């Protein structure tokens, strides 16, 4: 809402064309570049309308049920902590604004409560909805200790405030991760604030036993009827890393035996699929880090994994891609930007894919921060599992992983770690899937 | 310190023995019940000291490593949004206190900004400061002077208070550098008054919606299991499932040395390297599930008329639960739901924390007789596939594990247990290893079982 309020209706405003254009107007669409012969400094943008992957009758149904499932999702994600709260001006209430948190069914002293010399009597009310208040300061009368509503009354202002330094909140009902919006009040004044109720996060620390690559890194791949390429890969890896474990997910119809020291071969139902096999491979990794390589890759003296290890050891990144070099001699890092822009409510949003990166990774020449990369990368195993390779993407997929991970996964890309590359209804289905899964109406590729 | 500050040193205080005992004193330990013959109303508590799984050397080492990796983890988790901020009393500054959020490298109008100063003054001025973004004011209110549009520091100056406040209604924040999930603590200020507040900078969460296809069980549910050289039990299981659910997919992870053929309609059989193990096989099975929900069953189970999956589906369809366990009935006729409570208590800094396991539940699940909320359950359960994958079956747990899953999920996974959905049950160095693993993984020194 931009429209001027009554109180300020008279006050004149000239719109800043430039800045108002920065706001999300929930009206995005996806348009193709003008067609024909291209121009040198222009990139051709091409649009995909995912709504056209449905029968117009089915489209309505899909949009409805997608909206319904989304409303359900909201209700199980969102917290009173996410409410817009406005701090009142000119209140004598001093209260914690953020960063007050308790474990479920635990207790804490509440910081920073006070009432800001000598009056009649001073009284403050505390109200909670998922917990109970407790504290005795000489001179101060308490009403409601061990209840959701607590009154503190004291002729001593210093006293009242000293007792406030000793006010405790206790979570009274068990929930996993929520919050309780408390009310702190005095005569003619009201303040809302939120205590977060949650468990501390699982830190998932790795035992240890430069860098021990065998201890830190598992190599994961997926193959299908390409045993020649796969064996060349394993041979090449062994030329530089003799004891690193290689996990191989395999959905071949008549699987050959693959074995050797530190190789683990997993057989899947014939044509179970690509991402399913990737999900399989990662689920078997016990090391801090996993390296994804395609079955058609070859290690060279340029595949210096230590450098990728270094990056993840020394930076907050979760995933760091290398570069893949074609036999044509060109090496790509496939640095991609993925952003979702708000579209019409219930049509869905618009995905924008474009080549590029966000910024250089300070301290690490040749490395940048981006949204997606080529399928040669080292990553924290847990973060990869957290995002997952959606087993439904069975045939042709790549960026969809980075899209599933978008914002959750800290992505980087280093050009100096290099691996060599050895020389439909599915499309429609994926369009329907991505429409539903990610609430998209369309996408542009660039 | 409990100690009073100088300002308040003169004030007398009574220690509530009862209340002080509620606080975390970072000093837990784990002690066994007395030995000998038990008494009827008493439950035997048994302690495990995890630290005894290491030599004094290794203990020292591991504590160090663990503390270092923990500090690392903290630094990549924690945010300015976690800082304690205290709202000033008697300030003319009105500002958003929580719930203001922007996507990285995007922009928003900042809600609720205003200066509630008294009218009559010669000039009104407000300062805005950011650290990861820049201010702009969209439409310009006539009478207001702006300094710093498109910079991290912005000044609004106006003779008219009305004008200033109208201008504040139009202030925008833009994120200027890309990060995935962080926050920026802004400063809003006027003469002799200061207000801090935090804008969260993050992407909206992946909603991961499932097409729906009362309830189509084949669409909503995949059944997952893991077997090892027990094809008799497994075939009985599949036969029993098919007696009630002809087209539900059964995913079977298998680490047998010489695997038999399992196949039949809607069966997916996955072969693992010999003896890769228990949780690894569970992790494998779940990684292959495409449905909104997964049902875990052991290879030694049997479906009966009592295995009415629809009821478990109903629970997850109608409640915020992520996982809902059933009951497993022994051939002795007793059915267990194995409702467990798991809690960690803060221990001495760098010895680690104490895990308390005890039989029990938190409360009844309102609206669903026979169902409770708890921390862990027996290995018969329906769950949201994504949440199960989010927690994972640690592939390191190769032999003997159960509650370890619920512990890995503790806090993250919303657990329920219904007594009325029932399945039948057909008639060391590794211990030390697991103890060392649990020590690091969960920063624990000891545990008690009850
Ligand atoms: C590295 O890990 C391997 C295999 O996991 C182990 O056998 C070896 O002792 C480790 N090496 C070092 C230098 O710690
Ligand atoms: C349930 O879903 C399955 C799996 O795709 C489908 O083949 C079957 O037709 C569905 N049953 C009904 C009646 O919805
Ligand atoms: Mn290829
Ligand atoms: Mn058994």
Numbering used by the authors:
A (entry chain A): 53 to 168, 171 to 189, 192 to 265, 272 to 485, 511 to 533
B (entry chain B): 53 to 265, 272 to 485, 511 to 533
Question: What wording appears in the published article?
Answer:
The localisation, activity and abundance of these glycosyltransferases is tightly regulated in cells to ensure different ganglioside levels are correctly maintained. β−1,4-N-Acetyl-Galactosaminyltransferase 1 (B4GALNT1) is a key enzyme of the ganglioside synthetic pathway, responsible for the synthesis of complex gangliosides. B4GALNT1 catalyses the transfer of an N-acetylgalactosamine (GalNac) from a Uridine diphosphate-GalNac donor (UDP-GalNac) onto the glycan headgroup of the ganglioside acceptor substrate. B4GALNT1 is a type-II membrane protein with a predicted domain structure consisting of a short (7-residue) N-terminal cytoplasmic sequence followed by a transmembrane helix and a 56 kDa lumenal domain.
The B4GALNT1 lumenal domain construct ΔN46 was crystallised for structure determination. Initial crystals possessed no ligands in the active site and diffracted to relatively low resolution, 3.6 Å. Microseeding during crystallisation combined with inclusion of manganese (Mn) in purification buffers improved the resolution of the structure to 2.94 Å for an apo-complex. In the apo structure of B4GALNT1, a long loop encompassing residues 486–510 was completely disordered. C Surface representation of the B4GALNT1 active site illustrating that in the Mn-bound (purple sphere) structure, without UDP ligands, the pocket is open and residues 486–510 are disordered.
